[PDB]
């Protein structure tokens, strides 16, 4: 019931990020939520001698009609101590990504029972904004461990293992991983059976609240990395071979022995784009060898936990979005495609926002950290609207791509 | 005596790793010394300051400015060195309330509490750093030493500690008087209500007594203002608001000053006067950096100000906000990357107006600019009214649908409807997704010599048509564009174009409708004339006979 001593890194002041404007209904929701949190001692009002600030907003999570508060602790997380004192955080379970099913359980409400270092509380300051700068902003600071802070799972880590030491004692087949306010539970188990062991944990978490009700069902193994495909045709136009040669030349940056000599020789002469060309036997051979080259994975593609992960996203149209996760260019650690059943037939930014959340989820499962996104969207459009469709309690970093990349063709 | 409730003290520290101020007291004339001891004597016996001993090593200089007109002397402490050493405070001062956000209230009173900041106690542990010295006559005695017991003026933390304390005190009065509203900005208290003027001044009277409970004196017999009032460059009237009437300066050789005091002042007019344009006067600025340099007015400037000396002729007013009615925002394209907008709830009665200027960009189009302006008005509306307005846009629903479904970026504008007020935002060209059967295929290429800057651009087609043009003072990137221009210029209404220029693709795939480059603009004008254009890309130096038999033609 006592403090864990928490510092920042020397040479770094606390976060002083400005609160962005909020709709009237979001302010109202935050006032009601924070009034109850104040009554329960989780937060307390603060005076103007606290110069720190972290933005806050409010959303609605998946399949629920009640506002929830989210604090954008991204800046504070950068400035927070790294928690590898006696136990360096939580080593990532490489076995979680190879389980047939993984389910995500919100365990964040358990952080609200463990006090936070009274010396550190001043750094968690946030502001409920007023409309039109009419009233001053209502200022709070956290007394308990805050959701969205990277220190919260690190501090609760020791007290979380006792909570699961009975569960993983009974079920050594199950891999449980904690990231931020989420519990990731995976197993090689049958689908109906995997759901059964899960609320066994949910009931097992209520027993210790004496001294969190729905589930997201990921499937890591039912998914795989993605190869480069080449068309299979019986008649090729000039255009067809031109696109083929372009894709092969692009793939030759990733795979070494890719050759285009015999196919590009077919493109010599100034023929109509829609004219059919028979394939040279040497060209048919070259296309065949290129295919087998593309069936093996890239050689020497290694994950380096010392370097950032970068995620690129391309809008392909009709609700389809491609993406790649890499650390070095031309060295994809995962690629994928996300299409419909998103609810945004007419909203590009909702689809992109949901794509960002899913890619981050996959990235948390595989490596235990979030990637830096390169988003195909203007900064002004994204920063205006992404909080309208955000549902996760973590937030990644992102930059913006203003020049249309040629590679959208090759990943289509 | 009715007892006073103590105002809670805000703990204050100095910046980490910083001592206190130690500044010497400047030599004052004998008459000024006389005034300062007079002033400090009354405020000492008012409990505001107190003499300190020889212990306190900190010192802040103090001056006395005889006020103008009034034959009085008023005191001045220059806290600049102490402000540098004091901790940073929380910043509520982020914005200035906009008149169009105020709701229409029947009765509204405003009370200046420029008095009350001095009845607020200062943190005792911090008063030792407020020390100052009254220099004695002829410097023959030790200067009388003083320190502050309450929030000093000109001090860093005074405005934030004063407003924080005032908000604390106002909470239960507002909470238990929901039939009023109390806004608090700067040194003023805004109190509005929808009850009859009788019960208003009673609740005003009740508030002043509520503030007496903490020892904060309030203006009474008049001295508190009622609308209308001149405030922050606005004119707030009971039913309407407007900019302060503020009239353009006149010069024949216009300085930097001259329009730095005019676009900043034409920007002010644009928030209620519709259609104010500023561009042909701001180009005369960013291309200069001298705060006295003179610039003659360009030919399009005296045409634009002649319209700024034309909208500023009749008074136009804004209405206050009605939360029960919908918020409407309407946008008009003005030309040269200029956009004007009006926000209203009823026709003919704007809450406010405004403008948006394109971003500095190498290339652009109308849709991206309209999209950006929608985002600016969205954020401005959230700030002012707490909600997103419904938009009326000069773009057809099918134009927007084709745009966002085919644009390579993700894009979105909130709920909106088409308003048919030209000039309408349009898609000026649309590239084909597949090659065109029966259209001539132009294989284009260009190349330049980095040294001589001579180059060639041209094409070869499937019908045997060919052209190569010699060029001077050009780059590889320019010749690649010029090759495409030639093919567009020399082809029929439908044409397939094959290029290896990733530079050209990057420009055209971004779909500009206007450019800085005079060459890109020619290409755009040619695209607009076409019926179908399919632009294909192939990798260079693979000898793809189009981009080979014309690569061997443009480098020869
Ligand atoms: N600087 C002059 C000083 N104030 C004013 O005149 C003033 C007039 C109107 C507002 C005003 C309007 C709107 C807001 C809000 F933001 F709430 F919408 C607000 F906070 C204040 N202020 C005063 N001096 C005396 C003489 O003792 C009386 S008033």
From Swiss-Prot, chain B:
Domain Reverse transcriptase: 46-236
Effect of residue 442 to A: Virions contain primarily p51 RT
Mutation effect (residue 301 to L): 68% loss of polymerase activity. 10% loss of RNase H activity
Effect after changing residue 237 to A: Complete loss of RNA-dependent DNA polymerase activity. Complete loss of RNA 5'-end and 3'-end cleavages
Impact noted for substituting residue 403 to A: Almost complete loss of RT p66/p51 heterodimerization. Complete loss of polymerase activity
Effect of residue 169 to L: 80% loss of DNA-directed DNA polymerase activity. 23% loss of RNA-directed DNA polymerase activity
Free-text note regarding domains: RT is structured in five subdomains: finger, palm, thumb, connection and RNase H. Within the palm subdomain, the 'primer grip' region is thought to be involved in the positioning of the primer terminus for accommodating the incoming nucleotide. The RNase H domain stabilizes the association of RT with primer-template.
Annotated effect of mutating residue 189 to A: 76% loss of DNA-directed DNA polymerase activity. 60% loss of RNA-directed DNA polymerase activity
Other remarks on this protein: Error-prone enzyme that lacks a proof-reading function. High mutations rate is a direct consequence of this characteristic. RT also displays frequent template switching leading to high recombination rate. Recombination mostly occurs between homologous regions of the two copackaged RNA genomes. If these two RNA molecules derive from different viral strains, reverse transcription will give rise to highly recombinated proviral DNAs.
Effect listed in the UniProt record for changing residue 541 to D: Severely reduced exonuclease activity of RNase H, but no effect on endonucleonuclease activity
Biological source species: Human immunodeficiency virus type 1 group M subtype B (isolate BH10) (HIV-1)
Consequence recorded when altering residue 191 to I: 25% increase of DNA-directed DNA polymerase activity. No loss of RNA-directed DNA polymerase activity
Effect of residue 112 to S: 5- to 12-fold decrease in affinity for dTTP substrates. Strongly decreased RNA-directed DNA polymerase activity. Slightly decreased DNA-directed DNA polymerase activity. No effect on RNase H activity
Effect of residue 416 to L: Almost complete loss of RT p66/p51 heterodimerization
Protein name: Reverse transcriptase/ribonuclease H
Consequence recorded when altering residue 503 to F: Almost no effect on RNAase H activity and replication
Listed result of changing residue 54 to G: 74% loss of polymerase activity. 86% loss of RNase H activity
Consequence of substituting residue 186 to I: 54% loss of polymerase activity according to PubMed:9533880; increases polymerase activity according to PubMed:9657675. No loss of RNase H activity
């Amino acid at each position: 019931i006592e403090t864990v001593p928490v510092k920042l890194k020397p040479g770094m002041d606390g976060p002083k990020v400005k609160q962005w404007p909020l709709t009237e209904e979001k302010i109202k929701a935050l006032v009601e939520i924070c009034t109850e949190m104040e009554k329960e001692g989780k937060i307390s009002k603060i005076g103007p001698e606290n110069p720190y600030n972290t933005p806050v907003f409010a959303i609605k999570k998946k399949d629920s009609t009640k506002w929830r508060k989210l604090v954008d602790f991204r800046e504070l997380n950068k400035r927070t101590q790294d928690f590898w004192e006696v136990q360096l955080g939580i080593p990532h379970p490489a076995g979680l990504k190879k389980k047939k099913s993984v389910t995500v359980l919100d365990v964040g409400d358990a952080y609200f029972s463990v006090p936070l270092d009274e010396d550190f509380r001043k750094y968690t300051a946030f502001t409920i904004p007023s409309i039109n700068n009419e009233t001053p902003g209502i200022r709070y600071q956290y007394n308990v461990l805050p959701q969205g802070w990277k220190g919260s799972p690190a501090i609760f880590q020791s007290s979380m293992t006792k909570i699961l030491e009975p569960f993983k004692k009974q079920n050594p087949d199950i891999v449980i991983y904690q990231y931020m306010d989420d519990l990731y539970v995976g197993s090689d188990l049958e689908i109906g059976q995997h759901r059964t062991k899960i609320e066994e944990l949910r009931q097992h978490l209520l027993r210790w609240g004496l001294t969190l009700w729905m589930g997201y069902e990921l499937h890591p193994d039912k998914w795989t990395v993605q190869p480069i495909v080449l068309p299979e045709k019986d008649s090729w136009t000039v255009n067809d071979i031109q696109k083929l040669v372009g894709k092969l030349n692009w793939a030759s940056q990733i795979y070494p022995g890719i050759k285009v000599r015999q196919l590009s020789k077919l493109l010599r002469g100034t023929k109509a784009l829609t004219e059919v060309i028979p394939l040279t036997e040497e060209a048919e051979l070259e296309l065949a060898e290129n295919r087998e080259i593309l069936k093996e994975p890239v050689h020497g593609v290694y994950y380096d936990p010392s370097k950032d992960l970068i995620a690129e996203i391309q809008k392909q149209g009709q609700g389809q979005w491609t993406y790649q996760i890499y650390q070095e260019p031309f060295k994809n650690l995962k690629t994928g495609k996300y299409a419909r059943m998103r609810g945004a037939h007419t909203n590009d930014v909702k689809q992109l926002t949901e794509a960002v959340q899913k890619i981050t989820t996959e990235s948390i499962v595989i490596w235990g950290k979030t990637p830096k996104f390169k988003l195909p969207i203007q900064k002004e459009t994204w920063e205006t609207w992404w909080t309208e469709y955000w549902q996760a309690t973590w937030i990644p970093e992102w930059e913006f791509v203003n020049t249309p990349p040629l590679v959208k063709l090759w990943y289509q | 005596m009715v007892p006073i409730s103590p105002i809670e003290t805000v703990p204050v520290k100095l910046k980490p790793g910083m001592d206190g101020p130690k500044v010497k007291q400047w030599p004052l004339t004998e008459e000024k010394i006389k005034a300062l001891v007079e002033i400090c004597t009354e405020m000492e016996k008012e409990g505001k300051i107190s003499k300190i001993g020889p212990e306190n090593p900190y010192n802040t200089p103090v001056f006395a400015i005889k006020k103008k007109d009034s034959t009085k002397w008023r005191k001045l402490v220059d806290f600049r060195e102490l402000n540098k050493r004091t901790q940073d405070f929380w910043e509520v001062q982020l914005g200035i309330p906009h008149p169009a956000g105020l709701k229409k209230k029947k009765s509204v009173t405003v009370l200046d509490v420029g008095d009350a900041y001095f009845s607020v106690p200062l943190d005792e542990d911090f008063r030792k750093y407020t020390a100052f010295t009254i220099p004695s006559i002829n410097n023959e005695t030790p200067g009388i030493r003083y320190q502050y017991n309450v929030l000093p003026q000109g001090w860093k933390g005074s405005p934030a500690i004063f407003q924080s304390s005032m908000t604390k005190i106002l909470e239960p009065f507002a909470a238990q008087n929901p039939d009023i509203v109390i806004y608090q900005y700067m040194d003023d208290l805004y109190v509005g209500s929808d009850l009859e003027i009788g019960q208003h001044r009673t609740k005003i009277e009740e508030l002043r007594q509520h503030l007496l409970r903490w020892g904060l004196t309030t203006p009474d017999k008049k001295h508190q203002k009622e609308p209308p009032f001149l405030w922050m460059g606005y004119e707030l009237h009971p039913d309407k608001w407007t900019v302060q009437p503020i009239v353009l300066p006149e010069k024949d050789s216009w300085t930097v000053n001259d329009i730095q005091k005019l676009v900043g002042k034409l920007n002010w007019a644009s928030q209620i006067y519709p259609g104010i344009k500023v561009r042909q006067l701001s180009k005369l600025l960013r291309g200069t950096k001298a705060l006295t340099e003179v610039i003659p007015l360009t030919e399009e400037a005296e045409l634009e100000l002649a319209e700024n000396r034309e909208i500023l002729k009749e008074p136009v007013h804004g209405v206050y906000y009605d939360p029960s009615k919908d918020l409407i925002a309407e946008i008009q394209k003005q030309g040269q990357g200029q956009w004007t907008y009006q926000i209203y709830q009823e026709p003919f009665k704007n809450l406010k107006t405004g403008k948006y200027a394109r971003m500095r960009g190498a290339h652009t189009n109308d849709v991206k600019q309209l999209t950006e302006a929608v985002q600016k008005i969205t954020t401005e509306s959230i700030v002012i009214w707490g909600k997103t307005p419904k938009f009326k846009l000069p773009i057809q629903k099918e134009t927007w649908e084709t745009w966002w479904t085919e644009y390579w970026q993700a894009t979105w504008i909130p709920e909106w409807e088409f308003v048919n007020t030209p000039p309408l935002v349009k898609l000026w060209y649309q590239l084909e997704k597949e090659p065109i059967v029966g259209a001539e295929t132009f294989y284009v290429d260009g190349a330049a010599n980095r040294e001589t800057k001579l180059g060639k651009a041209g094409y070869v087609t499937n019908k045997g048509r060919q052209k190569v043009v010699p060029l001077t003072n050009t780059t590889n990137q320019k010749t690649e564009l010029q090759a495409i221009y030639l093919a567009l210029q020399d082809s029929g209404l439908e044409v397939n174009i094959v290029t290896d220029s990733q530079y050209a693709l990057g420009i055209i795939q971004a779909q500009p409708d206007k450019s800085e480059s005079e060459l890109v603009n020619q290409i755009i004008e040619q695209l607009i004339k076409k019926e179908k254009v399919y632009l294909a890309w192939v990798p260079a130096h693979k000898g793809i006979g189009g981009n080979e038999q014309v690569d061997k033609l443009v480098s020869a």
